[PDB]
Write a protein that binds this ligand. Structure first.
Ligand SMILES: NC(=O)C1(CNc2ncnc3[nH]c4cc(Br)ccc4c23)CC1
Ligand SMILES: [Cl-]
Length: 167
């Protein structure tokens, strides 16, 4: 039993809710919140901009030190950093950005990072400003993630479409 509330169960291990991931993280304080990161950990907009704003820019400060030491992530890759006031840990995961021409096949590799964590609060990777079809992202999530994932979808209209079209 965990503290996530109001989710629709899609499969054995995948759950979904119309929610602001920032507000959900602040309420649940999950062990792991997933950020929709880019390779530079520049948290300017979308989910990343919102999460970073909620940390009062502490996420960005920590991220800049990480990049200065380690260099950029790979598309499809991840790193574990602090969750600040939102979670114990933040798993920064880089899905392909279609608006940059990146290979959508890397979306499966991106979701594989979730399997290193028993339970996660997450957005749909490569959705939103990353330009992928969220219906496809949900399909890849369900077919790739084996650990327990609680998906927060900000847009109510999109949430209803994701549920109603789910196979
Ligand atoms: N834009 C979308 O509808 C999707 C991706 N964005 C988010 N997904 C889940 N929680 C989120 N909290 C946010 C807060 C701010 Br401010 C901006 C964006 C998001 C966000 C669901 C596809
Ligand atoms: Cl977004």
């Amino acid at each position: 039993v965990n503290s996530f509330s109001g989710y629709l169960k899609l499969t054995d291990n995948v759950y979904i809710k119309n929610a602001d991931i920032v507000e959900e993280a602040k309420k649940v304080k999950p062990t792991v919140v997933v950020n929709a990161a880019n390779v530079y950990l520049k948290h300017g907009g979308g989910v990343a901009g919102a999460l970073n704003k909620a940390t009062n820019n502490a996420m960005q400060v920590e991220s800049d030190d990480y990049i200065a030491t380690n260099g950029p992530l790979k598309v499809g890759g991840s790193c574990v950093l602090s969750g600040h006031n939102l979670a114990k840990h933040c798993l920064h995961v880089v899905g392909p950005n279609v608006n940059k021409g990146e290979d959508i096949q890397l979306l499966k590799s991106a979701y594989e990072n979730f399997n290193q964590h028993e339970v996660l609060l997450a957005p749909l990777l490569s959705a939103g400003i990353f330009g992928a079809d969220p219906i496809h992202s949900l399909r890849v999530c369900v077919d790739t993630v084996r650990t327990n994932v609680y998906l927060a979808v900000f847009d109510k209209n999109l949430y209803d479409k994701l549920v109603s079209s789910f196979l």
